[PDB]
Structure formats: C-alpha cells, structure tokens
C-alpha cells in the first residue's frame, strides 16, 4: 500500500511419506539471533522442488519457508541442523513452511 509492503502469506503443513529408494524430492537451502520479518521468515528454504515427487505431490513448491520439522521450530536453526533433523525421521518427514508473495 502506500504506506508499506502488502503480502499474502500462506500456511502449509504436509507429511512426506517416501520409498527407501527415493528421496524426498526437494532440495535445501541456508539463507544466512535471527528476527522472522514477512519477507524473510525463517533461515532454511526450499531453493528447488522436484515436480511430480513426494514434496510436489503433497503441496511444497521452490520458495517455501521452513517453520516446523517433525514438531520442533526451525525458523532460526541453522542449515546442518536442520539437514540432520529431517534425517532423523528416515522416510517420514511432517514439516510446516510458509509460502510468501510480495506485492
Ligand atoms: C544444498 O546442496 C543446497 C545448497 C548448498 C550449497 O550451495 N553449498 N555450497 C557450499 C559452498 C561452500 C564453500 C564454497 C567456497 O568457499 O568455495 C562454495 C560453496
């Protein structure tokens, strides 16, 4: 508006369930105490999706940020951390990310 910055920003949680033989689909990525701002919510992003894999088929998409993995906040855990945490859960991953859209 003419006062500031408009976003619409969407919500997702998803549960990743994957083969043995397969990875999630998705690849990783470290932006940089940390504050969330609306355009830069959290350190870890989705810098790619695999179309048709398991994140695609369940709703993430290239840009998203993430929030939650497998009940415990990410949004200022760093990126080896985090890597190490979706490793943990083997084949199944429940992650929270947002989706932002600036205006
Ligand atoms: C994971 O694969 C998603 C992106 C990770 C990434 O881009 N890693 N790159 C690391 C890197 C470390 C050191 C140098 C350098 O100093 O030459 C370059 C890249």
Same mark, same amino acid.
């Given at each position: 508006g003419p006062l500031g910055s408009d976003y619409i920003i969407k919500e997702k949680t998803v549960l990743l369930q994957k083969k043995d033989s397969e990875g999630f689909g998705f690849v990783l990525r470290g932006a940089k105490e940390f504050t969330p701002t $609306? @355009?830069? $919510? @959290?350190?870890?992003?989705?810098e790619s999706v695999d179309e048709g894999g398991v994140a695609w088929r369940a709703g993430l998409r290239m840009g998203d940020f993430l929030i939650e993995v497998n009940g415990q906040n /990410? /949004?200022?855990?760093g990126h080896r951390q985090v890597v190490n945490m979706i490793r943990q859960g083997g084949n199944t991953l429940m992650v929270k990310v947002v989706m932002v859209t600036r205006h």
């Open positions: $609306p @355009a830069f $919510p @959290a350190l870890q992003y989705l /990410v /949004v200022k855990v």
